[PDB]
Paper text:
The protease is responsible for processing the polyprotein into mature protein products and is essential for viral replication. The HuNoV protease has the general topology of a chymotrypsin-like protease with each monomer containing two domains. The active site is formed from a cleft between Domains I and II, and three substrate-binding pockets (subpockets I, II, and IV) coordinate the positioning of the peptide substrate for nucleophilic attack. In the consensus mechanism of norovirus cysteine proteases, proteolytic catalysis occurs with Cys139 acting as a nucleophile.
Sydney 2012 unliganded protease crystallised in space group C2221 with four chains in the asymmetric unit. The electron density quality was consistent with a 2.79 Å structure with continuous density for each protein chain, some missing residues at the N- and C-terminus, and with several side chains omitted from the model due to weak density. In the ligand-free protease crystal structure, we observed two distinct conformations for Arg112 in the Sydney 2012 GII.4 protease. In three chains (Chains B, C, D), the guanidino group of Arg112 is oriented towards the active site and interacts with Glu54. As noted in earlier reports, Arg112 in this closed conformation likely prevents the unprotonated imidazole nitrogen of His30 from being positioned optimally to deprotonate Cys139 for nucleophilic attack. Arg112 also occupies the middle of the active site cleft and may sterically hinder the entrance of substrate. In contrast to the closed conformation observed in chains B–D, one chain (chain A) adopts an alternative conformation, whereby Arg112 does not interact with the catalytic triad but faces away from the catalytic centre. In this orientation, the Arg 112 side chain is involved in a crystal contact that includes residues Ala127, Lys128, Ser129, and Thr134 from an adjacent chain. The movement of Arg112 out of the active site makes Glu54 more available to interact with His30, which is oriented toward Cys139 for deprotonation, promoting an active state. The unliganded protease was solved with one chain in the open conformation and three in the closed, indicating that there is enough flexibility in this region of the structure for the active conformation to be available for the subunits in the GII.
Author numbering:
A (entry chain A): 3 to 181
B (entry chain B): 1 to 175
The structure:
Amino acid sequence: PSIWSRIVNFGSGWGFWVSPSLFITSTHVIPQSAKEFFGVPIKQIQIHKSGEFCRLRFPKPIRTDVTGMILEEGAPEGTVATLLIKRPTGELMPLAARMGTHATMKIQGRTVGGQMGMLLTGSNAKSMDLGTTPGDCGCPYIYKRGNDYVVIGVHTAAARGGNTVICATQGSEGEATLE
Amino acid sequence: APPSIWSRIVNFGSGWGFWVSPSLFITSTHVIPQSAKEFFGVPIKQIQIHKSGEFCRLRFPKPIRTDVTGMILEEGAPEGTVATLLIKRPTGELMPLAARMGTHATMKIQGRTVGGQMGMLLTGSNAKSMDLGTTPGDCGCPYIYKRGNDYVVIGVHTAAARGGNTVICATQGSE
């Protein structure tokens, strides 16, 4: 099956099926108060919210047609990852983005954390087919390792110019404390 | 890309074609049905067929697509322009692929000599990819970009290089 089949509507945004039981999305697109997800009661779902990242594990497999997939935390700096954007009009937009350091961004009255990236379309990211839109939150960032696909996070925010984007990852890594 | 631009893209032979005006139809010479005798119900004798490299222009005697207007056609695009390859798939999906346009050149692809304006896909993946790139049978899809407030077509897809993000856009002229 196609990889785009793993990207489904969820709340006000999108979500990605990493496996028949694992489903990742952005936190600010989840329904604020719901009773069930994909026919499963909320109490029977293992839900982990780490910053803007959100993961859902189900007690029984849901999407039995997809296979397991690698979910790393970010990508090496300089990697040209791909954001897979789905629009409600039916279009599929693979947008390339060079990934940089992890960072926080001041947006609205708050701050949003994740790995920073810059789209390769440059200033042309103001166009609708060359950049992101707030409705694309939850769409996945992936890149190819060998002959396999690796998802590193989901779209959560973009800067005022639209060129710089933020990828929500499983969590930030602090430096160790030895002995 | 409004729904009108997408409606101008139609199936044609081995690939796709683009209605520039109600009477003009551009496509790639690679996807032409060679053993045909009628295009859109019109015999071949009545249609002006002009081939510039892999680019193919068809001028019909009577208007065929009366629902479309006339849009601008450019003999290539300025270097560095970020255009959009509008791919339609038989699954019904729409796939706009961003591509940075470069210089005109000629390559040898699968034993065929193909000339045109070269571009590089900004999709992160190689130009030959089912889920993220182009496939055989995507030829004829147009390259579109917005100059000021006019959507213009610079050419049609005719070839994708193996092992890289390079694509060839057949244009009507070198300038």
